[PDB]
Amino acid sequence: ADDALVRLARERFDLPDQVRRLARPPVPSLEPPYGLRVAQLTDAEMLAEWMNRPHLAAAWEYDWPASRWRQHLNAQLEGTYSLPLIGSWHGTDGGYLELYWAAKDLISHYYDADPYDLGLHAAIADLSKVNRGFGPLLLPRIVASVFANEPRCRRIMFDPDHRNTATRRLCEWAGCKFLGEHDTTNRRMALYALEAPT
């Protein structure tokens, strides 16, 4: 039972040749004092702790034991679908993200996805900096980086819980195109698309 390979619930396998052929999503970059790096299986303990916190346990529902987060991380790292990232500033890790190919994800069943569509999940470990509007500040840079790395990507997908008004409003103020509420495997979400700059 030495950490067997688990199956990511949201991963789609009935992919077209163009999509299946896609390598793992590029690692975006943030200029100092901010940094982004690929997560490591050793980040499991830290992430499990982060995700078991009030604000994240309710929004991600991924409040599992280190062992499990280890499996989630490994499953992503071993494929070419989702890329887990750690965000830092001033030598400290304070954020977790997931940059994944939308065409290889569950959300591609609720809208016509372009082959290079990218999705982005993100969380701030500091319950504090959340109430500070830290995310709204960094997100724009991250998105720009993401778009920069993949000139082919026509949009970045956001899928907050339909009840997450705070996040939905952010999507709205940013100019995202609303793509409806959809009942999915385990929850009802509000799908938003941030079109790449023209």
Coordinates of C-alpha atoms in Angstrom, one line a residue:
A1 CA 0.0 0.0 0.0
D2 CA 3.0 2.2 -0.5
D3 CA 1.2 5.4 -1.5
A4 CA -0.7 3.9 -4.5
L5 CA -1.6 6.2 -7.4
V6 CA -5.1 7.7 -6.8
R7 CA -7.5 8.9 -9.4
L8 CA -8.2 12.6 -9.5
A9 CA -12.0 12.9 -9.4
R10 CA -12.1 15.9 -11.9
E11 CA -9.8 14.5 -14.5
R12 CA -11.3 13.7 -17.9
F13 CA -9.8 10.9 -20.1
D14 CA -12.1 10.9 -23.2
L15 CA -9.8 13.5 -24.8
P16 CA -9.2 14.5 -28.4
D17 CA -5.7 13.8 -29.8
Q18 CA -4.9 17.5 -29.8
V19 CA -5.8 17.7 -26.1
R20 CA -4.4 14.4 -24.8
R21 CA -1.1 15.4 -26.5
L22 CA -0.7 18.5 -24.2
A23 CA 2.2 18.4 -21.8
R24 CA 1.7 19.5 -18.2
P25 CA 0.7 23.2 -17.8
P26 CA 3.7 25.7 -17.7
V27 CA 4.9 27.0 -14.3
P28 CA 3.9 30.6 -14.2
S29 CA 6.3 33.1 -12.5
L30 CA 6.0 35.9 -10.0
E31 CA 8.6 38.7 -9.6
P32 CA 10.3 39.1 -6.2
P33 CA 9.3 39.5 -3.4
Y34 CA 6.8 37.0 -4.7
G35 CA 7.5 33.5 -5.9
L36 CA 5.7 30.5 -7.3
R37 CA 7.2 27.0 -7.4
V38 CA 5.9 23.5 -8.2
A39 CA 4.6 21.7 -5.1
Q40 CA 6.5 18.7 -3.8
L41 CA 5.2 15.6 -2.2
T42 CA 6.9 16.9 1.0
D43 CA 4.5 19.9 0.9
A44 CA 1.8 17.4 1.9
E45 CA 1.9 18.0 5.6
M46 CA 1.9 21.8 5.2
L47 CA -1.0 21.7 2.7
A48 CA -3.1 19.3 4.8
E49 CA -2.7 21.7 7.7
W50 CA -3.6 24.7 5.5
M51 CA -6.6 23.0 3.9
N52 CA -7.9 21.9 7.3
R53 CA -8.3 25.5 8.4
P54 CA -11.7 27.2 8.7
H55 CA -11.8 29.3 5.5
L56 CA -10.2 26.6 3.2
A57 CA -11.9 23.5 4.5
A58 CA -15.2 25.0 3.5
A59 CA -14.1 26.4 0.1
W60 CA -12.0 23.5 -1.0
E61 CA -13.5 20.6 0.9
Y62 CA -10.1 19.0 0.7
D63 CA -9.5 18.7 4.4
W64 CA -7.7 15.4 4.4
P65 CA -4.7 13.9 6.3
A66 CA -1.2 14.6 5.0
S67 CA -1.1 11.0 3.5
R68 CA -4.1 11.9 1.3
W69 CA -2.9 15.3 0.2
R70 CA 0.3 13.4 -0.7
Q71 CA -1.8 11.3 -3.0
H72 CA -3.5 14.3 -4.5
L73 CA -0.2 16.0 -5.1
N74 CA 1.4 12.9 -6.6
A75 CA -1.6 12.2 -8.9
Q76 CA -1.3 15.7 -10.3
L77 CA 2.5 15.7 -10.6
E78 CA 2.5 12.4 -12.4
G79 CA 0.1 13.5 -15.1
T80 CA -0.2 16.3 -17.7
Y81 CA -3.5 17.7 -16.4
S82 CA -3.1 19.7 -13.2
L83 CA -0.1 21.6 -11.9
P84 CA 0.0 22.3 -8.1
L85 CA 1.9 25.4 -7.1
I86 CA 3.1 27.0 -3.9
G87 CA 3.1 30.8 -3.4
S88 CA 5.6 32.6 -1.3
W89 CA 6.7 36.1 -0.2
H90 CA 9.6 37.1 2.0
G91 CA 10.8 33.5 2.4
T92 CA 7.5 32.1 3.6
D93 CA 4.9 29.9 1.9
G94 CA 1.4 31.3 2.1
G95 CA -0.6 30.1 -0.9
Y96 CA -1.5 27.1 -3.0
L97 CA -2.7 27.0 -6.6
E98 CA -3.7 24.6 -9.2
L99 CA -3.2 25.4 -12.9
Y100 CA -5.0 22.8 -15.0
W101 CA -6.1 22.2 -18.6
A102 CA -9.8 22.8 -18.7
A103 CA -10.2 20.4 -21.7
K104 CA -8.9 17.7 -19.4
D105 CA -11.2 18.6 -16.6
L106 CA -14.8 18.1 -15.5
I107 CA -15.8 21.7 -16.3
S108 CA -15.4 21.0 -20.0
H109 CA -18.7 19.1 -19.8
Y110 CA -20.6 22.3 -19.0
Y111 CA -19.3 24.6 -21.7
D112 CA -17.5 24.2 -25.1
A113 CA -13.8 24.3 -24.1
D114 CA -11.1 25.4 -26.4
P115 CA -8.1 23.0 -26.4
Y116 CA -5.8 25.6 -24.7
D117 CA -8.3 26.7 -22.0
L118 CA -6.7 26.8 -18.6
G119 CA -8.4 26.6 -15.2
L120 CA -7.1 28.1 -11.9
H121 CA -7.9 27.2 -8.3
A122 CA -6.2 29.3 -5.6
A123 CA -6.1 29.6 -1.8
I124 CA -4.4 31.8 0.8
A125 CA -3.2 30.0 3.9
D126 CA -3.4 33.2 6.0
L127 CA -7.0 33.6 7.2
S128 CA -5.6 37.1 7.9
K129 CA -4.3 38.2 4.4
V130 CA -7.5 37.0 3.0
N131 CA -9.5 39.8 4.7
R132 CA -6.8 42.2 3.5
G133 CA -7.5 41.9 -0.3
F134 CA -4.1 40.2 -0.9
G135 CA -5.5 37.8 -3.4
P136 CA -7.1 40.5 -5.6
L137 CA -3.7 42.1 -5.8
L138 CA -1.6 39.0 -6.8
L139 CA -4.2 37.2 -9.0
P140 CA -3.8 39.8 -11.8
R141 CA 0.0 39.1 -12.0
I142 CA -0.5 35.4 -11.9
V143 CA -3.0 35.4 -14.7
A144 CA -0.8 37.7 -16.8
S145 CA 2.1 35.2 -16.3
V146 CA -0.2 32.3 -17.1
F147 CA -1.3 34.0 -20.3
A148 CA 2.3 34.9 -21.1
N149 CA 3.5 31.3 -20.9
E150 CA 0.7 30.0 -23.2
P151 CA -0.1 32.5 -26.0
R152 CA -2.6 29.9 -27.3
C153 CA -4.7 30.0 -24.1
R154 CA -7.8 32.1 -25.0
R155 CA -9.2 32.1 -21.4
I156 CA -8.8 31.1 -17.8
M157 CA -11.7 29.3 -16.1
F158 CA -12.9 30.0 -12.5
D159 CA -15.4 27.7 -10.8
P160 CA -16.3 29.0 -7.3
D161 CA -19.2 27.4 -5.3
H162 CA -22.4 29.2 -6.4
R163 CA -22.7 30.4 -2.8
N164 CA -19.2 32.0 -2.7
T165 CA -20.4 35.5 -3.4
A166 CA -17.1 37.1 -2.4
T167 CA -15.3 35.2 -5.1
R168 CA -18.1 35.5 -7.7
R169 CA -18.1 39.2 -7.3
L170 CA -14.3 39.3 -7.8
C171 CA -14.9 37.4 -11.1
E172 CA -17.6 39.9 -12.1
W173 CA -15.6 43.0 -11.3
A174 CA -12.6 41.6 -13.2
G175 CA -14.7 41.3 -16.4
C176 CA -15.2 37.5 -16.5
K177 CA -17.8 36.2 -18.8
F178 CA -20.5 34.3 -16.8
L179 CA -21.2 30.8 -18.0
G180 CA -24.0 29.8 -15.7
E181 CA -24.5 27.8 -12.5
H182 CA -24.1 24.1 -13.0
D183 CA -24.7 21.1 -10.7
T184 CA -21.6 18.9 -10.8
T185 CA -20.5 15.6 -9.4
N186 CA -20.5 16.9 -5.8
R187 CA -21.6 20.6 -5.8
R188 CA -23.3 23.4 -7.6
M189 CA -20.8 25.9 -9.1
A190 CA -20.8 29.2 -10.9
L191 CA -18.6 29.1 -14.0
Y192 CA -16.6 32.1 -15.1
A193 CA -14.2 32.7 -18.0
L194 CA -11.6 35.4 -18.0
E195 CA -10.9 36.1 -21.7
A196 CA -7.2 36.7 -22.6
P197 CA -6.3 40.4 -23.4
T198 CA -7.0 41.4 -27.0

